[PDB]
Paper text:
In the yeast [name] and other ascomycetes, the maintenance of cell wall integrity is governed by a family of plasma-membrane spanning sensors that include the Wsc-type proteins. These cell wall proteins apparently sense stress-induced mechanical forces at the cell surface and target the cell wall integrity (CWI) signaling pathway, but the structural base for their sensor function is yet unknown. Further studies have demonstrated that ScWsc1 function requires the presence of the N-terminal CRD, which can also be inactivated by mutation of its eight cysteine residues that are a hallmark of this highly conserved domain. Purification of ScWsc1 from yeast cells in lipid nanoparticles and transmission electron microscopy have recently provided the first broad three-dimensional model, which confirms the proposed tripartite organization of the sensor.
Given the general function of PAN domains in mediating protein–protein and protein–carbohydrate interactions, this finding underpins the importance of Wsc domains in conferring sensing and localization functions. For this purpose, we determined the high-resolution crystal structure of the CRD of ScWsc1, revealing a tightly packed globular core domain stabilized by four disulfide bonds. The protein surface of the CRD contains three aromatic clusters that are conserved in the CRDs of both ScWsc2 and ScWsc3.
Residue numbers in the entry: 14 to 110
């Protein structure tokens, strides 16, 4: 739509783990940040997290307050390979608008 600001979500950080309020929304062969945003927006969630190429989690608390950051969000999103869907042991966390 526009080249910058078209996505109704903002990257927070890469985290080692998720707070207990995060729950798996889906596993998907075409997982991506925009797919997970739509999944979690439909649930009314405030945050979403990508994990290990294919998994999408939704949650309501900011992991910044409770989990350590990570530099190992290195598993590409199956549905958008230039973006990382967390890592094997790390979560790419975004905030929904
Ligand atoms: Cl830019
Ligand atoms: Cl897009």
């Amino acid at each position: 739509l526009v080249p910058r600001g078209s996505h109704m979500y903002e990257y927070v950080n890469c985290f080692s783990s998720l707070p207990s309020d995060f729950s798996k929304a889906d596993s998907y062969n075409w997982q991506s940040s925009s797919h997970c945003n739509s999944e979690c927006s439909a649930k009314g969630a405030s945050y979403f997290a990508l994990y290990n190429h294919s998994e999408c989690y939704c949650g309501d608390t900011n992991p910044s307050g409770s989990e350590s950051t990570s530099s190992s969000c290195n598993t590409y999103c199956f549905g958008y390979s230039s973006e990382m869907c967390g890592g094997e042991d790390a979560y790419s966390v975004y905030q929904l608008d």
